[PDB]
């Protein structure tokens, strides 16, 4: 039941990986038939969908920024920028020469944007995380990516013991503080965006109990980072305040 709840949470995370989930809005969910249209204007299918996706993310983006995300499709940096003009001239999105940016035209639905805001980022585990024994897998039951942050994988010793020790610290939400933030933080002070969906996630998270585990990953140097956006003892002050130990103690 909690094992099942954990698999559901992981089910949502795996289904809302940002870029694959966005692509769905331009492939199998668009009324527009971008495959057919991209053939017409002589733009590679996978490239065109990705450019459309990048525009739904950035909304506005200068040229060096936009080619960076798409550079891996062509043998030349130049080939990418030309393809982008062909699409801008065919109204896939606009380029405004007076601000030197592309501006999105076709954006994803609001309903899909909210699921991405809730679930594209890792959540806490509601069972004890998997014991790490190799430098693959980060504690969840369905991810087996490199445990080291960014592209810095090694199979050398990176002190899994510390990750394993931090991962089993049970945490819970202080709803008294969490409610204080939503009702009164805005008049005490990126924040609105986080808080729009944070409480919904925290309630879903703790559906089976106010007890959970944050996963931890090392960067290449050995600084240790707890993974997650909405619930995290690292990161923002409105974030820090809500977390406490699940194993409370009488102080004296």
């Amino acid at each position: 039941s909690t094992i099942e709840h954990q698999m559901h949470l992981e089910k949502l995370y795996n289904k809302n990986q940002l870029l694959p989930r966005m692509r769905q809005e331009f492939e199998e969910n668009s009324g527009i038939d971008f495959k057919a249209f991209f053939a017409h204007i002589g733009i590679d299918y996978k490239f065109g969908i990705d450019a459309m996706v990048q525009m739904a993310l950035h909304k506005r983006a200068d040229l060096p920024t936009l080619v960076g995300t798409l550079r891996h499709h062509c043998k030349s940096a130049q080939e990418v920028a030309d393809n982008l003009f062909k699409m801008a001239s065919e109204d896939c999105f606009n380029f405004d020469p007076t601000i030197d940016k592309f501006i999105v035209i076709y954006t994803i639905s609001d309903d899909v944007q909210h699921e991405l805001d809730s679930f594209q980022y890792p959540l806490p585990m509601v069972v004890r995380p998997k014991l790490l024994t190799k430098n693959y897998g980060t504690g969840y039951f369905t991810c087996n990516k490199s445990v080291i942050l960014k592209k810095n994988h090694t199979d050398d010793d990176i002190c899994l013991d510390h990750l394993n020790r931090m991962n089993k610290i049970p945490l819970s939400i202080n709803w008294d503080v969490a409610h204080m933030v939503k009702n009164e933080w805005a008049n005490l002070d990126a924040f609105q965006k986080y808080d729009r969906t944070a409480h919904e996630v925290m309630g879903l998270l703790t559906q089976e109990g106010n007890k959970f585990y944050l996963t931890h990953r090392p960067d290449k140097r050995g600084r240790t980072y707890s993974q997650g956006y909405h619930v995290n003892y690292q990161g923002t002050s409105w974030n820090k305040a809500v977390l406490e130990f699940a194993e409370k103690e009488v102080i004296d």
């Binding site: 002190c159 290449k220 130990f245 409370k248």
Partner: protein, 404 residues
């Protein structure tokens, strides 16, 4: 090191979040005692409202005798400078950043703010209208310790102000500053990656990623497209930041090992050290046990991680008295510790222990040879750096505001 009650760490933490975190311990508790009965109304003017409120609600729950899950926070005062001071034995740098105690003429131990101390020293000598803001000075200092030459050149120009800035740094922290100096001249123009091992076995690999700029035309106007690519570079400015950060990383892993320990593992190792454990042996433990003990020998940093590889056969290669001494230096009751690289949070009835464990680690770095051990791996040959004051470590154990 003076100790505090569990409730007092709560008092300090609530003071910190108001916050008067640069005040001495007793002034902070004095401020608290004064506002104990009015805390909920100060939430709206506190520096960290949410954290202030959580701590205050915890204080109330404690008064009523209720259990709490709220962890108080104790932060390192300039983590990096502390580590460079300990690596180099730089007693003057240590006094900037609470690695050892600084007393004013009255003789009270003060909570020093290195950036302010150096800001004062710079106005004191520049004098007579010095056109420099305290925060422009803090940015230049902290970017320098991570190896920047461009940012102090921007705050101080490239003239006499810069000259006074480097002069001040060289009197207040000669060895720390000389070491940062040295790291710059330590890049290898042939290297694609740097690798070093920490004494607890963490392998640090730094791939050298250099900018490749493809230039592009879009409407016959030019755009520069820069992508990080693996390569080499003549100098490199990254080693001071990465080595220093690898060490505060180490301090975090090891501090969490010493605080959040498995009491049953501890008792097994204690019997194992005293020859009373039932025979158990695995051939796979030998390599790692040998490896970690070696780092202790070469560095002075005995990691409690070694408990994971000690068995009936492997204990024979280590000094059982050193293992027992380590366990005895650990807290008598374990506790969870949350860490933000150089911030530490725990239940307040363990406040005293977390400050003791941090002190011991700074002191270990101070006493031993970690810098040589790491520099040798970075530059590719055996080098030895000496302590500028080899007894600094004695005072480090007893220092007051390392965490504040």
């Amino acid at each position: 090191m003076q100790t505090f009650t569990a409730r007092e760490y709560l008092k300090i933490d609530i003071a910190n979040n108001y916050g008067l975190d640069k005040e001495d311990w007793d002034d902070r508790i004095a401020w608290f005692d004064k506002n104990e009965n009015n805390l909920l109304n100060l939430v709206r003017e506190a520096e960290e409202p949410a954290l202030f409120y959580a701590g205050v609600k915890a204080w109330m729950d404690v008064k009523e005798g209720k259990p709490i899950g709220y962890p108080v926070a104790l932060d390192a005062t300039s983590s990096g400078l502390q580590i460079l001071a300990c690596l180099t034995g730089d007693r003057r740098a240590a006094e900037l950043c609470n690695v050892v105690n600084y007393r004013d003429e009255s003789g009270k131990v003060k909570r020093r703010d290195a950036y302010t101390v150096i800001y004062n020293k710079m106005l004191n000598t520049l004098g007579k209208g010095a056109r420099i803001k305290r925060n422009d000075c803090k940015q230049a200092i902290m970017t320098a310790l991570y190896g920047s030459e461009a940012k102090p050149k921007e705050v101080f120009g490239e003239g006499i102000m810069l000259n006074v800035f480097e002069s001040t740094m060289n009197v207040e922290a000669p060895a720390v500053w000389e070491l940062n100096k040295f790291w710059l001249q330590c890049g290898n123009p042939e290297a694609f990656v740097y690798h070093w091992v920490m004494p607890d076995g963490f392998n640090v690999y730094i791939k050298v990623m250099v900018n490749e700029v493809e230039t592009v035309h879009f409407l016959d106007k030019p755009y520069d497209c820069v992508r990080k690519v693996q390569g080499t570079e003549e100098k490199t400015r990254m080693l001071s930041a990465n080595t220093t950060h690898s060490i505060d990383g180490l301090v975090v892993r090891e501090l969490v090992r010493r605080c959040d320990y498995d009491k049953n593992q501890i008792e097994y190792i204690k019997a194992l050290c005293n020859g009373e454990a039932e025979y158990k042996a695995s051939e796979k433990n030998y390599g790692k046990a040998m490896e970690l003990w070696g780092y202790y020998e070469k560095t002075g940093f005995l990691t409690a991680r070694i408990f994971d590889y000690l068995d009936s056969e492997t204990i024979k290669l280590v000094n059982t008295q050193d293992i027992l001494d380590l366990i005895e230096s650990m807290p008598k009751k374990p506790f969870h510790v949350l860490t933000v690289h150089d911030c530490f949070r725990c239940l307040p009835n363990y406040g005293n222990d977390i400050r003791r464990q941090y002190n011991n680690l700074l002191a270990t770095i101070a006493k031993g040879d970690l810098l040589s051990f790491i520099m040798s791996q970075v530059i590719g040959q055996e080098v030895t750096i000496g302590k500028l004051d080899p007894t600094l470590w004695e005072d480090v154990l007893e220092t007051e505001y390392a965490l504040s």
